[PDB]
Design an enzyme around this catalytic site. Structure first.
Site, short mmCIF file in Angstrom:
data_model
loop_
_atom_site.label_atom_id
_atom_site.label_comp_id
_atom_site.label_asym_id
_atom_site.label_seq_id
_atom_site.Cartn_x
_atom_site.Cartn_y
_atom_site.Cartn_z
N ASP A 203 -2.56 5.60 -5.04
CA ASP A 203 -2.72 4.59 -4.00
C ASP A 203 -2.83 3.14 -4.52
O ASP A 203 -3.91 2.70 -4.92
CB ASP A 203 -3.96 4.96 -3.17
CG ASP A 203 -4.11 4.15 -1.89
OD1 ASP A 203 -5.07 4.40 -1.15
OD2 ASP A 203 -3.27 3.27 -1.60
N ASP B 121 0.75 -1.24 0.00
CA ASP B 121 0.00 0.00 0.00
C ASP B 121 0.79 1.30 0.00
O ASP B 121 1.27 1.74 1.06
CB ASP B 121 -0.91 -0.09 1.24
CG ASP B 121 -1.73 1.13 1.46
OD1 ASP B 121 -2.24 1.71 0.48
OD2 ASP B 121 -1.89 1.50 2.63
#
Ligand SMILES: COCCCOc1cc(C[C@@H](C[C@H](N)[C@@H](O)C[C@H](C(=O)NCC(C)(C)C(N)=O)C(C)C)C(C)C)ccc1OC
Ligand SMILES: *[C@H]1O[C@H](CO)[C@@H](O)[C@H](O)[C@H]1NC(C)=O
Length: 338
Positions: free
Chosen positions: A224, A38
């Site tokens: 992201d 992430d």
């Protein structure tokens, strides 16, 4: 910064085009975990064997048991990680983690409180934050910083490839220390980071169909890798969705399936280029029936300051555009994925 000769890749699994994760081993002998890499955060964490079984998410995921690892080193500092869509809490521990052939001593969080929403819906067990130390809760040195400290990676960069995986194929791929020319074509085009310690860049505009309907005065886009969709603030999204004739539900927007192929293109003006997605790229076209609702891979998400307000370019965007995260030059590069 000492560069080397090595680049390592982690093969990812694609769960229904919404969750991309790979594997890591922790402790001695290794305890394996499915984790999301992430870029939206900077901490590493996995469910703990100390998590109460009253948290059903802990009943359904792999739990790290320090008592079975001989390389474990205790710390115990409390840690609470607040993500835009959920929170996990636990304490710090240290152990050796293997990520695609690389072995590194890392401090990670052992999660003891893990909410059913959203973790019961997670195919992954934990997270390997790929962000900067500036965003690390508890100031814990991120895993990539620790790998770079070893002076083995050819370049101070990491790249993401997310497939449109649908049974005998590669769900995705992360390359540590470079990129894989086999998964993109054309050249990379870069945008420098608009800030220090966040994978966020300036976005000049967002156009739907004919003209720049949104972000006319410029805005921010956080790239992201741990996000399923492209998200924008509720304001922006309401206006975008207005243009699409999409209907707002509780957690997403839908459109009558037959209308899906009809939807206009949506472009994101990043740096020198326009990044265009057709309806096929953002509509989950599961039917062509006017009697069924098809969800869109674009959502509304309001991130609070100082990071937000900001758009977030997730898997919907990354699937079309191979992404390289360049720490060395604080920029992000996009290339057409193949
Ligand atoms: C692409 O597939 C990856 C997983 C997608 O699915 C899920 C994603 C999340 C959220 C992400 C995390 C977010 N991407 C998060 O990084 C978003 C950022 C965030 O909240 N960061 C945390 C910090 C502490 C840095 C912060 N608040 O700023 C925002 C600033 C954009 C997980 C890795 C936990 C939770 C549940 C999911 O499926 C069931
Ligand atoms: C554990 O980790 C931090 C570094 O993030 C260290 O400086 C701290 O003092 C340690 N505490 C204990 C009790 O081990």
């Amino acid at each position: 910064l000492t560069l080397g000769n090595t680049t390592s890749s982690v093969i990812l699994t694609n769960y229904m085009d919404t969750q991309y994760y790979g594997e890591i081993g922790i402790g001695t002998p290794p305890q394996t975990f499915k984790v999301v890499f992430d870029t939206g955060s900077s901490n590493v964490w996995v469910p703990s064997s100390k998590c109460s079984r009253l948290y059903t998410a802990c009943v359904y995921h792999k739990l790290f048991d320090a008592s079975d690892s001989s390389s474990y080193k205790h710390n115990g500092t409390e840690l609470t990680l607040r993500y835009s869509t959920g929170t996990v809490s636990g304490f710090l521990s240290q152990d050796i983690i293997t990520v695609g052939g690389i072995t590194v001593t890392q401090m990670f969080g052992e999660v003891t409180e893990m909410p059913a929403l959203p973790f019961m819906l997670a195919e992954f067990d934990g997270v390997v934050g790929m962000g900067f130390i500036e965003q690390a809760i508890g100031r814990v040195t991120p895993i990539f910083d620790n790998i770079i400290s070893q002076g083995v990676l050819k370049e101070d960069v990491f790249s993401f490839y997310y497939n449109r995986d649908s049974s005998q194929s590669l769900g995705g791929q992360i390359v540590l220390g470079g990129s894989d020319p086999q998964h993109y074509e054309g050249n990379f085009h870069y945008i420098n980071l608009i800030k220090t310690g966040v994978w966020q860049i300036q976005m000049k505009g967002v156009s739907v169909g004919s003209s720049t309907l949104l972000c006319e005065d410029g805005c921010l886009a956080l790239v992201d890798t741990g996000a399923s969709y492209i998200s924008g603030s509720t304001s922006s999204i309401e206006k975008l969705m207005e243009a699409l004739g999409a209907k707002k539900r509780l957690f997403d927007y839908v459109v009558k399936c037959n209308e899906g192929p009809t939807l206009p293109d949506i472009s994101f003006h990043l740096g020198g280029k326009e990044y265009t997605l057709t309806s096929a790229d953002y509509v989950f076209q599961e039917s062509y029936s006017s009697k069924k609702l098809c969800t869109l891979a674009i959502h509304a998400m309001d991130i609070p300051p100082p990071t937000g307000p900001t758009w977030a370019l997730g898997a919907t965007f990354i699937r079309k555009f191979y992404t390289e995260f360049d720490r060395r030059n604080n920029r992000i590069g996009f290339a057409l994925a193949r």
